[PDB]
Symmetry: D2
Subunit: 127 residues, 4 copies
């Protein structure tokens, strides 16, 4: 189910859209990683996007501490299902989550076979 290591506060969400069909990208695998002091990527949270191309409950507020996180979207598998040959191996978003900055993090990604865009909406409220 479109959730990860924290069905609660939802301080981090991922939304994936398909720019070829103009629909959400459903069942896309997403793996979230946290950088360890030994500077390697330790698995953190993961899941498959829902029917609306969203993924929530990846983490919890108490678990989501300041650090460097990497969100990796398996775009290649998604396009392969569609019978379309892609260019990227996957799409990744590497960022520093800080405490002073706003609360919630929505990472959106818009996919095309040879292109992808990603934006971050950082705010304080709900949705």
């Amino acid at each position: 189910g479109p959730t990860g290591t924290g069905e609660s506060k939802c301080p981090l969400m991922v939304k994936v859209l398909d720019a070829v069909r103009g629909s959400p990208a459903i069942n896309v695998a997403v793996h979230v990683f946290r950088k360890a002091a030994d500077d390697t990527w330790e698995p953190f949270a993961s899941g498959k996007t829902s029917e609306s191309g969203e993924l929530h409950g990846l983490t919890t507020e108490e678990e989501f501490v300041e650090g460097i996180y990497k969100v990796e979207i398996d775009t290649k598998s998604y396009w392969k299902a569609l019978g379309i040959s892609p260019f990227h191996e996957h799409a990744e978003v590497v960022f520093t989550a800080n405490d002073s900055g706003p609360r919630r993090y929505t990472i959106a990604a818009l996919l095309s076979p040879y292109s992808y865009s990603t934006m971050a909406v950082v705010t304080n409220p709900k949705e």
Copy 2:
């Protein structure tokens, strides 16, 4: 209030994001137009985006008939408030709404001073 000519079914919605600050673009004016047979743009619906950068209730299902619609976002005013000199006069999205194709229309726009992207998510459910 972030609504237009139809606080009901919500067959058409507009979401605007600011890629410079990573927040929704609030209070952006949007004017929706419908093409008349005399092929001119007749005003249709309009509004200002909410705190979450969204605009709903622009129209109603019975009003939203097949045709060519133009969504015009006043990006220039938005950037001027921010004290940033923009390039575009505004951003526009011209499209043909058909009945066989999926139900709801979400038009999203991501703004930067010298660039803008727009995508359409056409589906059948809710959100």
Copy 3:
């Protein structure tokens, strides 16, 4: 340079790329208009993109006067010739040009069936 009506130093250039195929968008029709005194769009220049997805020689520096211009890219015909039913009728770029001296404008567009991004690169001439 090549004055009168041709690329003196090519003050206006358009570059179009196909995001589904990883290639330049070839043979795309482009129409440029200029806001006329009476507040209407007068035909200014037109062309088709080359093998490199580019269009040069649309105007000259002497004719490219201060004004509001609209670059219209026939995205629809392009996608249709490919067997794809796009979402937008066209992509339009509206901007004020040369209001504080002659500049060189490169308008780029990245195309996907349900999405397009546009970017402007403005350069202050010399030789």
Copy 4:
């Protein structure tokens, strides 16, 4: 052509543009890696973008062998030098290259503080 380690026919090129200023992204650090046999990223090539926001001569056609490569763009340092606190640490592009013959790869990136788009243009060489 210029073999050994230089742009024989420039099989790999990177182009970076600034979406906030309408200009090429100058002096941006770029690091290319290649997936090593042991499944780790080995340093392949590096450079900084020129005045045109471009980077050529990163490799040669004889050395640019079949493999999985990662183009890392130091977006963070760029935005910071400008007095802007960006969201991402960098922008990364991961792809398989030359698996069915040598191709020419142009990797473009459009940068905004909280957003970036990336596009690949693949060409089949000749002369």
